Design a protein around this ligand. Structure first.
Ligand SMILES: [Mg+2]
Ligand SMILES: [Mg+2]
Ligand SMILES: [Mg+2]
Ligand SMILES: [Mg+2]
Ligand SMILES: [Mg+2]
Ligand SMILES: [Mg+2]
Ligand SMILES: [Mg+2]
Ligand SMILES: [Mg+2]
Ligand SMILES: [Mg+2]
Ligand SMILES: [Mg+2]
Ligand SMILES: [Mg+2]
Ligand SMILES: [Mg+2]
Ligand SMILES: [Mg+2]
Ligand SMILES: [Mg+2]
Ligand SMILES: [Mg+2]
Ligand SMILES: [Mg+2]
Ligand SMILES: [Mg+2]
Ligand SMILES: [Mg+2]
Ligand SMILES: [Mg+2]
Ligand SMILES: [Mg+2]
Ligand SMILES: [Mg+2]
Ligand SMILES: [Mg+2]
Ligand SMILES: [Mg+2]
Ligand SMILES: [Mg+2]
Ligand SMILES: [Mg+2]
Ligand SMILES: [Mg+2]
Ligand SMILES: [Mg+2]
Ligand SMILES: [Mg+2]
Ligand SMILES: [Mg+2]
Ligand SMILES: [Mg+2]
Ligand SMILES: [Mg+2]
Ligand SMILES: [Mg+2]
Ligand SMILES: [Mg+2]
Ligand SMILES: [Mg+2]
Ligand SMILES: [Mg+2]
Ligand SMILES: [Mg+2]
Ligand SMILES: [Mg+2]
Ligand SMILES: [Mg+2]
Ligand SMILES: [Mg+2]
Ligand SMILES: [Mg+2]
Ligand SMILES: [Mg+2]
Ligand SMILES: [Mg+2]
Ligand SMILES: [Mg+2]
Ligand SMILES: [Mg+2]
Ligand SMILES: [Mg+2]
Ligand SMILES: [Mg+2]
Ligand SMILES: [Mg+2]
Ligand SMILES: [Mg+2]
Ligand SMILES: [Mg+2]
Ligand SMILES: [Mg+2]
Ligand SMILES: [Mg+2]
Ligand SMILES: [Mg+2]
Ligand SMILES: [Mg+2]
Ligand SMILES: [Mg+2]
Ligand SMILES: [Mg+2]
Ligand SMILES: [Mg+2]
Ligand SMILES: [Mg+2]
Ligand SMILES: [Mg+2]
Ligand SMILES: [Mg+2]
Ligand SMILES: [Mg+2]
Ligand SMILES: [Mg+2]
Ligand SMILES: [Mg+2]
Ligand SMILES: [Mg+2]
Ligand SMILES: [Mg+2]
Ligand SMILES: [Mg+2]
Ligand SMILES: [Mg+2]
Ligand SMILES: [Mg+2]
Ligand SMILES: [Mg+2]
Ligand SMILES: [Mg+2]
Ligand SMILES: [Mg+2]
Ligand SMILES: [Mg+2]
Ligand SMILES: [Mg+2]
Ligand SMILES: [Mg+2]
Ligand SMILES: [Mg+2]
Ligand SMILES: [Mg+2]
Ligand SMILES: [Mg+2]
Ligand SMILES: [Mg+2]
Ligand SMILES: [Mg+2]
Ligand SMILES: [Mg+2]
Ligand SMILES: [Mg+2]
Ligand SMILES: [Mg+2]
Ligand SMILES: [Mg+2]
Ligand SMILES: [Mg+2]
Ligand SMILES: [Mg+2]
Ligand SMILES: [Mg+2]
Ligand SMILES: [Mg+2]
Ligand SMILES: [Mg+2]
Ligand SMILES: [Mg+2]
Ligand SMILES: [Mg+2]
Ligand SMILES: [Mg+2]
Ligand SMILES: [Mg+2]
Ligand SMILES: [Mg+2]
Ligand SMILES: [Mg+2]
Ligand SMILES: [Mg+2]
Ligand SMILES: [Mg+2]
Ligand SMILES: [Mg+2]
Ligand SMILES: [Mg+2]
Ligand SMILES: [Mg+2]
Ligand SMILES: [Mg+2]
Ligand SMILES: [Mg+2]
Ligand SMILES: [Mg+2]
Ligand SMILES: [Mg+2]
Ligand SMILES: [Mg+2]
Ligand SMILES: [Mg+2]
Ligand SMILES: [Mg+2]
Ligand SMILES: [Mg+2]
Ligand SMILES: [Mg+2]
Ligand SMILES: [Mg+2]
Ligand SMILES: [Mg+2]
Ligand SMILES: [Mg+2]
Ligand SMILES: [Mg+2]
Ligand SMILES: [Mg+2]
Ligand SMILES: [Mg+2]
Ligand SMILES: [Mg+2]
Ligand SMILES: [Mg+2]
Ligand SMILES: [Mg+2]
Ligand SMILES: [Mg+2]
Ligand SMILES: [Mg+2]
Ligand SMILES: [Mg+2]
Ligand SMILES: [Mg+2]
Ligand SMILES: [Mg+2]
Ligand SMILES: [Mg+2]
Ligand SMILES: [Mg+2]
Ligand SMILES: [Mg+2]
Ligand SMILES: [Mg+2]
Ligand SMILES: [Mg+2]
Ligand SMILES: [Mg+2]
Ligand SMILES: [Mg+2]
Ligand SMILES: [Mg+2]
Ligand SMILES: [Mg+2]
Ligand SMILES: [Mg+2]
Ligand SMILES: [Mg+2]
Ligand SMILES: [Mg+2]
Ligand SMILES: [Mg+2]
Ligand SMILES: [Mg+2]
Ligand SMILES: [Mg+2]
Ligand SMILES: [Mg+2]
Ligand SMILES: [Mg+2]
Ligand SMILES: [Mg+2]
Ligand SMILES: [Mg+2]
Ligand SMILES: [Mg+2]
Ligand SMILES: [Mg+2]
Ligand SMILES: [Mg+2]
Ligand SMILES: [Mg+2]
Ligand SMILES: [Mg+2]
Ligand SMILES: [Mg+2]
Ligand SMILES: [Mg+2]
Ligand SMILES: [Mg+2]
Ligand SMILES: [Mg+2]
Ligand SMILES: [Mg+2]
Ligand SMILES: [Mg+2]
Ligand SMILES: [Mg+2]
Ligand SMILES: [Mg+2]
Ligand SMILES: [Mg+2]
Ligand SMILES: [Mg+2]
Ligand SMILES: [Mg+2]
Ligand SMILES: [Mg+2]
Ligand SMILES: [Mg+2]
Ligand SMILES: [Mg+2]
Ligand SMILES: [Mg+2]
Ligand SMILES: [Mg+2]
Ligand SMILES: [Mg+2]
Ligand SMILES: [Mg+2]
Ligand SMILES: [Mg+2]
Ligand SMILES: [Zn+2]
Lengths: 208, 124, 99, 138, 83
RNA sequence: AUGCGCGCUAGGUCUCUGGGUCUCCUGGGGGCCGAAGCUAACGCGUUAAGCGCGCCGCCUGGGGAGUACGGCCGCAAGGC
RNA sequence: GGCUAAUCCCCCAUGUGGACCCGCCCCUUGGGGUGUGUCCAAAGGGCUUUGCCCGCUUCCGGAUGGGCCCGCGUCCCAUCAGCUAGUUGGUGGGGUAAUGGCCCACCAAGGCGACGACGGGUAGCCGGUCUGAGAGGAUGGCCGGCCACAGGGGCACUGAGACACGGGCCCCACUCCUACGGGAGGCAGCAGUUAGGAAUCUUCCGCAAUGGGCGCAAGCCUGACGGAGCGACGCCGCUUGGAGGAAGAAGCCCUUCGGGGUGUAAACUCCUGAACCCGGGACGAAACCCCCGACGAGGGGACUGACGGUACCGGGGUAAUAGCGCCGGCCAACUCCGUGCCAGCAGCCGCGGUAAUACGGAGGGCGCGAGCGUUACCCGGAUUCACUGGGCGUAAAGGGCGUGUAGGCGGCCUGGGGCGUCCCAUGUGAAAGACCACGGCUCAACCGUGGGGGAGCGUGGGAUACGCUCAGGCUAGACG
């Protein structure tokens, strides 16, 4: 159970907008609209200078909450990237960017990531023609990620896609809105995504 | 040391002695209380600390601490020894695990409940 | 290959047998230098031909006695008693080191 | 008797240069000549000459250093910043080719004696041989 | 005597065998003389049988005995074919 | 409270004992200041505590304890 | 005590050949050939019955599995320093598949040890595993290889193989039966019981698969095994919802009484549809066998599931578990109240003697999350046994001083050798694991296929600077 509960609170503690609610994280309600201070009794108090540890921990939490991942999946992913050839930070982001649910979000099929997850687990998504109900599932370049033929007239789906008419998608992605399909073209680099994250801080955090 | 000296004598690997003979290498030992009493602590503090003399399954008699606020232990109650010592006490090398055997848990404790062995209460 | 080594004959004293001292060198697995170690092989001299001080090649063979798995191959150097006297000296040093 | 002649050379050089002496004499051996020749070729000394002190052969090593500097302590950057023995008698060290050190990230050298002669770590690798690791310089 | 037979390398309900020359008295799954082929009964990939008929015919020449199933697979690779 | 041997690294000054064309120079010892350098500092510095090599001895928190036990010395006291 | 068959035992023959003494030849430890002499063979059964099969006997190879021997590696204590009588060798012999004091007789006086013998302590070893940047430390459950044991101690018999776990004999301890003479056992096989313990499972299903024994087969046996069950023990996957929703309800907490907080969190709206119900429903299984062909090759045919109606697919379908540690510093997270050296905390530093972020509750927060903590233990940090990678004037640490034994170390040039060193080739370094890649279960875990690497040791070849050795010079050390 990767974190389930009040969210715009994490937006707040991380000090930046993470967009966990989709639209309305786009409204003037995000609570980063006039409560940009963290949650709790002490949120409005002058904040002491963070320890090196603090800084690093917090950056990592930012990244994780962005993807909505267990710690354990996140660690395993990182380590799996530290093993791989190529810059660890970037590989990591690439691997995170490769979760099916994330691909579904990224393709506009779902509004937020948590929603994308639900869409996957419920089997409204196919990958190359077969249903994949695992959110963790790794999309590989070349993969065609589609809305289920059966889920195609779902209210949430129709609205979500008529949204994406005229919208531009990730430059590592292809989209066909008529067909409710999209292709994962290539792994993204750190410039491809806008993340409010210095990944090198995360490498350091796990380096302790 | 010269290298030749190392080839002759070598370097001495140094062993550590166990802070705990609960023997067995075991994580806990069962025992029976012998004396259940109170004791005054070492030079910097004052209190009345609650302890039991325990006769272990492991053949040893040892003094164990009885953590938490209330306690039910008396001369014949059988108990579990978990090890870890009490610093400002004389010769108390192990703690009693509460909730196990004739040790009750700590009544009314709401806070770190698994230390102290008390169940989660219900709410209203 | 039946293993074959070289040593010097330090013991005359048996019947059709010779004690052959064999040195060997090798690097030390940790401290890295070369160390020199040695052991006495009991070797088969049926002819009673090889004498003390002879530096001989020695060979892996069919077992002769307990302790004799090696027989004398050939003589290489003759009469290095410097070796023998070294070893005898050690054995005399033994008489110290006790009680 | 010097117990290690080769070290005595390396050190003669060390102290020599650490006072900025212009040259220094070391009792001559063909091997020392070789080591020297490597340094010279590598830009570490200026060069050396075979010479005669009281009728005994020495090799005279002429040392180089950097420019003069500013602020307090004008003394010049050494050109041999660091020079040390690796193999010594009484612990002999031999690397095979795959075990040949790279030094100071390539900016330094190691001098190995090999059955192909005395060569720099790069030299030895290119020659594809190993041997007794004599010293490192940088 | 010496056998040509199957040894179980899969996982639970995922059986994959090694076609193997071994002494008869070994554990089924234990140390053998050679791996001649592989066998995947559940035919989960394009190659679910490899043989290497050359070594198979060797071992037959020195009188290894294939088991019944071993020999089926062996012959499937035409180790025994004369033409 | 500084194991032995060897090689290398400014000087100044006082001394003991040789040799030399005897302001002084050149050996071998004893002192004091001091270059570089070392050092936690104090200090050491061609009589190293500097730079290096060889070899020996030794160290691994305090107390318990140079104790106990064992062995070996010793007439004993006591020693190792 | 009596009868009787055989592929049971024996006798005579045949002697392909083989064994043994002796001689010669080749080869070189007992390898191969040859000559005379002596000795040694067999077993029948089935049929689709004049031939084919399943067998038998002797011999030579092969393959596979073993025995024995050797180099090297293999924990702690020297407060264990000497050990040794079959002990060390020799000759002859006994024994064995075979070498061997393995055993015996006779002879000799040896063998081993500070390069740690002897003694004591501990311990199955390994592939590997854990940890570490590495070097190193620690470890050897599961899987694979080896060894050893089968209540304790001895012993042999049968046999290709045992000194045999469900074989035999004896002694011992224990249980059981007994008519007191005497008998019967041996789960460290699967399950299960009991004891011990902090603690470790079902007296399950199946012979369908793979494997094993016997059988020409059909088959039979197989707690090997393939499966299922229980345990959050591990690992991996996944759920407890998704979107909207106030300038932001109640409650609660804090409050400078203005307000701040839990917080879009709830309520509520819409949507999806774990669970669950229905229908379909596997792969793993094609052989052996039968038929043609020739019992071959080849072709054709049939049977066969424990898992299990399981996985999986289709339909329907409900908003559907959250907990545990922590918030003085190390260390991410602060306030109120209670308590007043008490009660309690505590890994160290240290908190509590009326203003306690350190006790106890609450509000709030940080961290992980079907877990979270604790205890024990290993590596880590610990460059705190320092090979990498420490030191000894005053911090722990130079022996009171010498002499020299072993041992370590060795100036300049030349030549031979090529042992150390280095190089090339090759052999070995099983599989599993680790690594990379592709692949198979919807992913992963798990699994398969391929690839790479590699210390060490064996063999052949090569180099010669350095180390050694031999030879020959020199004088800068040393001595005279
Ligand atoms: Mg990386
Ligand atoms: Mg977008
Ligand atoms: Mg791209
Ligand atoms: Mg974004
Ligand atoms: Mg940025
Ligand atoms: Mg790390
Ligand atoms: Mg670390
Ligand atoms: Mg106090
Ligand atoms: Mg009671
Ligand atoms: Mg503890
Ligand atoms: Mg607490
Ligand atoms: Mg003799
Ligand atoms: Mg004999
Ligand atoms: Mg011979
Ligand atoms: Mg003696
Ligand atoms: Mg002594
Ligand atoms: Mg090598
Ligand atoms: Mg076997
Ligand atoms: Mg497939
Ligand atoms: Mg095929
Ligand atoms: Mg054929
Ligand atoms: Mg000068
Ligand atoms: Mg004068
Ligand atoms: Mg003087
Ligand atoms: Mg001074
Ligand atoms: Mg100075
Ligand atoms: Mg120093
Ligand atoms: Mg200073
Ligand atoms: Mg001088
Ligand atoms: Mg002076
Ligand atoms: Mg002096
Ligand atoms: Mg000196
Ligand atoms: Mg010092
Ligand atoms: Mg220490
Ligand atoms: Mg102490
Ligand atoms: Mg005393
Ligand atoms: Mg004692
Ligand atoms: Mg005494
Ligand atoms: Mg004494
Ligand atoms: Mg006495
Ligand atoms: Mg005294
Ligand atoms: Mg009868
Ligand atoms: Mg009758
Ligand atoms: Mg006959
Ligand atoms: Mg004949
Ligand atoms: Mg014979
Ligand atoms: Mg017969
Ligand atoms: Mg007959
Ligand atoms: Mg064999
Ligand atoms: Mg005897
Ligand atoms: Mg005789
Ligand atoms: Mg004999
Ligand atoms: Mg016998
Ligand atoms: Mg036998
Ligand atoms: Mg006899
Ligand atoms: Mg006798
Ligand atoms: Mg030895
Ligand atoms: Mg024992
Ligand atoms: Mg044991
Ligand atoms: Mg051990
Ligand atoms: Mg270490
Ligand atoms: Mg290792
Ligand atoms: Mg071990
Ligand atoms: Mg076990
Ligand atoms: Mg088992
Ligand atoms: Mg095993
Ligand atoms: Mg036994
Ligand atoms: Mg038993
Ligand atoms: Mg017993
Ligand atoms: Mg027995
Ligand atoms: Mg038999
Ligand atoms: Mg046995
Ligand atoms: Mg049994
Ligand atoms: Mg049996
Ligand atoms: Mg009896
Ligand atoms: Mg009974
Ligand atoms: Mg029974
Ligand atoms: Mg019996
Ligand atoms: Mg059992
Ligand atoms: Mg019990
Ligand atoms: Mg089980
Ligand atoms: Mg059954
Ligand atoms: Mg079967
Ligand atoms: Mg079968
Ligand atoms: Mg059969
Ligand atoms: Mg039939
Ligand atoms: Mg029948
Ligand atoms: Mg049965
Ligand atoms: Mg099983
Ligand atoms: Mg349980
Ligand atoms: Mg439980
Ligand atoms: Mg899990
Ligand atoms: Mg709406
Ligand atoms: Mg709206
Ligand atoms: Mg509000
Ligand atoms: Mg409110
Ligand atoms: Mg209120
Ligand atoms: Mg105010
Ligand atoms: Mg309010
Ligand atoms: Mg919500
Ligand atoms: Mg509404
Ligand atoms: Mg549906
Ligand atoms: Mg509905
Ligand atoms: Mg159903
Ligand atoms: Mg089937
Ligand atoms: Mg089929
Ligand atoms: Mg059958
Ligand atoms: Mg037919
Ligand atoms: Mg026919
Ligand atoms: Mg037929
Ligand atoms: Mg056929
Ligand atoms: Mg067929
Ligand atoms: Mg069924
Ligand atoms: Mg069925
Ligand atoms: Mg259907
Ligand atoms: Mg369905
Ligand atoms: Mg709900
Ligand atoms: Mg809802
Ligand atoms: Mg929570
Ligand atoms: Mg503090
Ligand atoms: Mg932490
Ligand atoms: Mg803090
Ligand atoms: Mg009170
Ligand atoms: Mg009060
Ligand atoms: Mg207070
Ligand atoms: Mg106070
Ligand atoms: Mg508090
Ligand atoms: Mg605390
Ligand atoms: Mg508290
Ligand atoms: Mg709370
Ligand atoms: Mg909470
Ligand atoms: Mg745990
Ligand atoms: Mg452990
Ligand atoms: Mg530790
Ligand atoms: Mg380290
Ligand atoms: Mg320590
Ligand atoms: Mg230290
Ligand atoms: Mg060191
Ligand atoms: Mg130190
Ligand atoms: Mg020193
Ligand atoms: Mg002083
Ligand atoms: Mg001191
Ligand atoms: Mg002294
Ligand atoms: Mg001396
Ligand atoms: Mg000497
Ligand atoms: Mg010499
Ligand atoms: Mg030399
Ligand atoms: Mg020498
Ligand atoms: Mg030469
Ligand atoms: Mg060579
Ligand atoms: Mg070559
Ligand atoms: Mg190779
Ligand atoms: Mg091999
Ligand atoms: Mg190799
Ligand atoms: Mg391998
Ligand atoms: Mg794997
Ligand atoms: Mg690797
Ligand atoms: Mg895949
Ligand atoms: Mg490797
Ligand atoms: Mg290896
Ligand atoms: Mg060679
Ligand atoms: Mg040559
Ligand atoms: Mg000479
Ligand atoms: Mg002369
Ligand atoms: Zn937000």
């Amino acid at each position: 159970g990767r974190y389930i509960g009040p969210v715009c609170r994490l937006c707040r503690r991380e000090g930046v907008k993470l967009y966990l609610k989709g639209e309305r994280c786009y409204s003037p309600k995000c609570a980063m609209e006039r409560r940009p201070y963290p949650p709790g009794q002490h949120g409005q108090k002058r904040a002491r200078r963070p320890s090196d540890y603090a800084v690093r921990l917090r950056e990592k939490q930012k990244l994780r909450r962005i993807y909505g991942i267990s710690e354990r999946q996140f660690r395993n992913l990182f380590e799996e990237a530290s093993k791989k050839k190529g810059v660890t930070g970037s590989v990591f982001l690439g691997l995170l960017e490769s979760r099916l649910d994330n691909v579904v979000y990224r393709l506009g099929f779902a509004v937020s990531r948590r929603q994308a997850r639900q869409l996957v687990r419920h089997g409204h998504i196919t990958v190359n023609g077969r249903r994949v109900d695992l959110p963790s599932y790794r999309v590989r370049p070349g993969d065609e990620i589609a809305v289920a033929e059966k889920s195609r007239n779902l209210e949430l789906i129709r609205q979500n896609l008529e949204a994406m008419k005229g919208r531009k998608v990730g430059p590592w992605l292809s989209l066909d809105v008529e067909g409710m399909k999209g292709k994962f073209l290539r792994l993204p680099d750190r410039e491809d995504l806008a993340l409010p994250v210095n990944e090198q801080l995360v490498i350091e955090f796990y380096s302790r | 040391p010269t290298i030749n000296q190392l080839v002759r004598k070598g370097r001495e690997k140094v062993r550590k002695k166990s802070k705990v003979p609960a023997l067995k290498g075991a994580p806990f030992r069962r025992g029976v209380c012998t004396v259940v009493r109170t004791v005054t602590p070492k030079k910097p503090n004052s209190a009345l600390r609650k302890v039991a003399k325990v006769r272990l399954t492991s053949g040893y008699e040892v003094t164990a601490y009885i953590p938490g606020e209330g306690h039910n232990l008396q001369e014949h109650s059988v108990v579990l020894i978990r090890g870890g010592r009490v610093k400002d006490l004389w010769g108390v090398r192990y703690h009693i695990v509460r909730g196990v055997y004739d040790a009750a848990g700590v009544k009314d404790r709401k806070k770190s409940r698994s230390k102290y062995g008390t169940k989660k209460p219900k709410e209203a | 290959p039946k293993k074959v080594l070289t040593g010097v004959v330090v013991s005359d004293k048996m019947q059709k047998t010779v004690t052959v001292l064999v040195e060997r060198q090798f690097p030390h697995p940790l401290y890295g230098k070369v160390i020199k170690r040695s052991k006495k092989y009991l070797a088969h001299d049926p002819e009673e031909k090889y004498k003390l001080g002879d530096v001989v090649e020695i060979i892996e063979s069919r077992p002769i006695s307990k302790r004799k798995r090696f027989r004398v191959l050939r003589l290489v150097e003759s009469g290095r008693m410097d070796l023998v006297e070294k070893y005898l000296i050690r054995r005399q040093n033994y008489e110290s080191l006790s009680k | 008797m010097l117990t290690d002649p080769i070290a005595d050379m390396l050190t003669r050089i060390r102290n020599a240069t650490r006072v900025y002496k212009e040259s220094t004499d070391v009792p001559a051996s063909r091997f020392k000549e070789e080591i020297l020749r490597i340094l010279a070729r590598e830009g570490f000394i200026k060069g050396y000459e075979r010479v005669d002190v009281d009728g005994k052969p020495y090799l005279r090593v002429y040392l180089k250093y950097g420019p003069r500097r500013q602020g307090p302590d004008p003394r010049p950057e050494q050109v041999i910043h660091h020079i040390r023995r690796i193999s010594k008698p009484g612990r002999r060290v031999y690397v095979g080719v795959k075990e040949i050190p790279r030094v100071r990230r390539g900016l330094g050298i190691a001098i190995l004696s090999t059955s192909k002669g005395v060569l720099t770590d790069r030299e030895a690798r290119k020659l594809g041989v190993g041997g007794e690791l004599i010293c490192e310089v940088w | 005597m010496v056998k040509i037979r199957l040894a179980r390398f899969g996982s639970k309900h995922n059986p994959h065998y090694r076609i193997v020359v071994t002494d008869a008295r070994r554990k089924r799954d234990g140390k053998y003389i050679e791996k001649i082929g592989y066998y995947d009964p559940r035919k989960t990939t394009p190659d679910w049988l490899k043989v290497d008929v050359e070594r198979a015919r060797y071992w037959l020449s020195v009188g290894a005995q294939p088991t019944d199933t071993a020999r089926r697979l062996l012959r499937q690779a035409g180790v025994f074919r004369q033409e």
